[PDB]
PDB file of C-alpha atoms in Angstrom:
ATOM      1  CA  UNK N   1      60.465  13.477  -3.310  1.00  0.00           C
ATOM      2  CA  UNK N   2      62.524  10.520  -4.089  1.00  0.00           C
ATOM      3  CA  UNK N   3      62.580   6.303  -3.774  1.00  0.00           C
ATOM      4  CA  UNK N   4      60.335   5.455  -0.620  1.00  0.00           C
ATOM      5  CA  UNK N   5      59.637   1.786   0.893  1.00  0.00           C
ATOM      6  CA  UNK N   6      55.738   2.004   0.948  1.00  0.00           C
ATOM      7  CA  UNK N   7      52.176   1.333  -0.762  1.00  0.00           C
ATOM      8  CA  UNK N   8      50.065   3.328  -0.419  1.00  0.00           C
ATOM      9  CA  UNK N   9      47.965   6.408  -2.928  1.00  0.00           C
ATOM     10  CA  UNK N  10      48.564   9.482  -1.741  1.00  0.00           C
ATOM     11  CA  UNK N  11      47.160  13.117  -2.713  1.00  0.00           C
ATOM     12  CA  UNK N  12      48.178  16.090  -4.587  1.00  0.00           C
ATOM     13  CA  UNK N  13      51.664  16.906  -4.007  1.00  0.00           C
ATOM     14  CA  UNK N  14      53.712  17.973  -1.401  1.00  0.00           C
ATOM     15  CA  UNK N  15      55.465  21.895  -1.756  1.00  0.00           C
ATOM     16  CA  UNK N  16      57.248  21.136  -5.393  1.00  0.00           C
ATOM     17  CA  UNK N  17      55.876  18.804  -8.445  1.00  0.00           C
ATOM     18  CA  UNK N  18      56.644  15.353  -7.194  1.00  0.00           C
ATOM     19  CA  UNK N  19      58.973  13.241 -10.149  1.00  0.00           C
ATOM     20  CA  UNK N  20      58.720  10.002  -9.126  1.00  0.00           C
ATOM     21  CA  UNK N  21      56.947   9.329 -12.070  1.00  0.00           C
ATOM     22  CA  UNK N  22      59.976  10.630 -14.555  1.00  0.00           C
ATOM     23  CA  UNK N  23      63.569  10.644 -13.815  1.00  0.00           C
ATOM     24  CA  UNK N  24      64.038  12.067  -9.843  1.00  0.00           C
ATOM     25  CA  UNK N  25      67.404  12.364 -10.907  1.00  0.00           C
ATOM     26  CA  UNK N  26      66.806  16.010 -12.274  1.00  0.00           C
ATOM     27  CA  UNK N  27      64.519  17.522  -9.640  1.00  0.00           C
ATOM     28  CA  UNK N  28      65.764  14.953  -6.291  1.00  0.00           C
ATOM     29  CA  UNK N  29      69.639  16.784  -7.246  1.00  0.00           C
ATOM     30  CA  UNK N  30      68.180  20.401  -6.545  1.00  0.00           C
ATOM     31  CA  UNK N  31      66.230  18.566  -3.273  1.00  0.00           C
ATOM     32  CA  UNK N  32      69.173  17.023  -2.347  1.00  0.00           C
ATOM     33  CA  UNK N  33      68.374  13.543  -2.225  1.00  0.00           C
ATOM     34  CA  UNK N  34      70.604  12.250  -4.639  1.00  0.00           C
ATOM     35  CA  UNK N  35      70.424   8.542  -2.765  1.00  0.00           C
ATOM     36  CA  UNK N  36      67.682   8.077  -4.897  1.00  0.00           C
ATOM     37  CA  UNK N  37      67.839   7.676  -8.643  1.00  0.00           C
ATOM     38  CA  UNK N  38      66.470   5.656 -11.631  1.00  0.00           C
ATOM     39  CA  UNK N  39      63.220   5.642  -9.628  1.00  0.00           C
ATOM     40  CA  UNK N  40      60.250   6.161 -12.270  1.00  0.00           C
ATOM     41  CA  UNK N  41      56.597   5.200 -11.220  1.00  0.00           C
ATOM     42  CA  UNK N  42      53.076   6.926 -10.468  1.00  0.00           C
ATOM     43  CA  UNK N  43      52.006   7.615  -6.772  1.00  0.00           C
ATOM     44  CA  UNK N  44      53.580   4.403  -5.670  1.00  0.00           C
ATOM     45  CA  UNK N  45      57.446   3.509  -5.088  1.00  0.00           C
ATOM     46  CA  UNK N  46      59.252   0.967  -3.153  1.00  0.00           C
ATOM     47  CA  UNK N  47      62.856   1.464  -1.705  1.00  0.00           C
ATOM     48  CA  UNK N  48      64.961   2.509   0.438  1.00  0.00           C
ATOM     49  CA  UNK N  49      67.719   5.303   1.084  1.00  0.00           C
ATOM     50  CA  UNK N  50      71.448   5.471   2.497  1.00  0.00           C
ATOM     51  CA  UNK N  51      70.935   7.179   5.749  1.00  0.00           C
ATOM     52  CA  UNK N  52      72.405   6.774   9.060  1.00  0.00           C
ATOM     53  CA  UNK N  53      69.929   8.639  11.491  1.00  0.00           C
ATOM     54  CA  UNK N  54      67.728   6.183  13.151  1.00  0.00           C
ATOM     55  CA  UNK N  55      64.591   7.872  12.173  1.00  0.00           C
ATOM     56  CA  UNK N  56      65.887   9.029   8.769  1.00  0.00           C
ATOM     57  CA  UNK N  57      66.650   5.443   8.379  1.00  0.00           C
ATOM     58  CA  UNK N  58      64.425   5.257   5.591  1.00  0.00           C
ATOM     59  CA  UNK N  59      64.135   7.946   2.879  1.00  0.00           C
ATOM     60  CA  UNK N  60      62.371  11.127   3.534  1.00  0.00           C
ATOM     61  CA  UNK N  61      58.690   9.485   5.340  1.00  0.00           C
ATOM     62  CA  UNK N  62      60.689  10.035   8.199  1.00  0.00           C
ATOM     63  CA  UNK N  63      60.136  13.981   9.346  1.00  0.00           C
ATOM     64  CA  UNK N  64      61.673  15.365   6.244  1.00  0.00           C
ATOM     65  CA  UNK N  65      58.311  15.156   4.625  1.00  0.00           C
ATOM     66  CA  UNK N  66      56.440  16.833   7.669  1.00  0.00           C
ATOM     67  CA  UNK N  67      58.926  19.653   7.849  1.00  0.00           C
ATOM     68  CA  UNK N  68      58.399  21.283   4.147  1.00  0.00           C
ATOM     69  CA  UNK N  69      56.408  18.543   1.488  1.00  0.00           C
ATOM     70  CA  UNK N  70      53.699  17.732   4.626  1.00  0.00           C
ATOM     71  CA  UNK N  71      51.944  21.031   6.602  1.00  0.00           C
ATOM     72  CA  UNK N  72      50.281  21.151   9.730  1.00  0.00           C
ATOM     73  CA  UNK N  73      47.737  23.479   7.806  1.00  0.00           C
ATOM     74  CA  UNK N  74      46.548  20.809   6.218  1.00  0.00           C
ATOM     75  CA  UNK N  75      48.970  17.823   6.216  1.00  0.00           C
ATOM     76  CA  UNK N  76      47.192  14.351   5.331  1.00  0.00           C
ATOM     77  CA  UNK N  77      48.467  11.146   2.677  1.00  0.00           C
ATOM     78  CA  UNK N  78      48.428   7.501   2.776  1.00  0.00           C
ATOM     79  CA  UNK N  79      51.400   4.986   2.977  1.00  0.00           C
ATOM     80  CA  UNK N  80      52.016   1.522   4.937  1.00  0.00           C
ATOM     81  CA  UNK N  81      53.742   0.434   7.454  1.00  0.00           C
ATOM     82  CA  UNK N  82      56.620   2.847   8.148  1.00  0.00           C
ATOM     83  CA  UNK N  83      58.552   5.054  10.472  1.00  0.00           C
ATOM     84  CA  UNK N  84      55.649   7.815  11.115  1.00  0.00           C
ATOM     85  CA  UNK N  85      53.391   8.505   8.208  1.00  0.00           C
ATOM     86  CA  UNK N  86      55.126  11.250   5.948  1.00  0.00           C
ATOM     87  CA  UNK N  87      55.969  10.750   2.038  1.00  0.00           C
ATOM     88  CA  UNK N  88      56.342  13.178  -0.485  1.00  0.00           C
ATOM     89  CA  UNK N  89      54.391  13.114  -3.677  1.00  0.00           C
TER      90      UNK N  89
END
């Protein structure tokens, strides 16, 4: 997980225990997303990330989320307007 432009609730977690709450800092390092930091709020963050890709633009709603935190077993979350429809937490 990690800082994401969008509004939205969304359910339990994705694979690991979602930090955006406490310091991402810790757990987004071991993710790899360290273009996120100093984010701390409940199931609802606004902000973007340094990427280049065009659909990676954002943060990780892009596919990242779809590939490992979202599954096709049983994928489903809310969020607004954005690339595709994948978050983390």
């Amino acid at each position: 997980a990690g800082m994401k432009t969008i509004e939205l609730h969304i359910t339990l977690q994705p694979q690991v225990l979602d930090t955006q709450g406490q310091t991402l800092t810790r757990a987004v390092h071991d993710l790899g997303y360290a273009q996120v930091n100093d984010i701390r709020v409940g199931k609802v963050l606004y902000m973007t990330v340094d990427e280049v890709s065009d659909e990676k633009v954002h943060n990780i709603i892009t596919t990242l989320s779809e590939k490992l935190f979202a599954n096709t077993v049983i994928e489903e979350y809310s969020y607004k307007v954005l690339d595709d429809e994948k978050e983390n937490a």
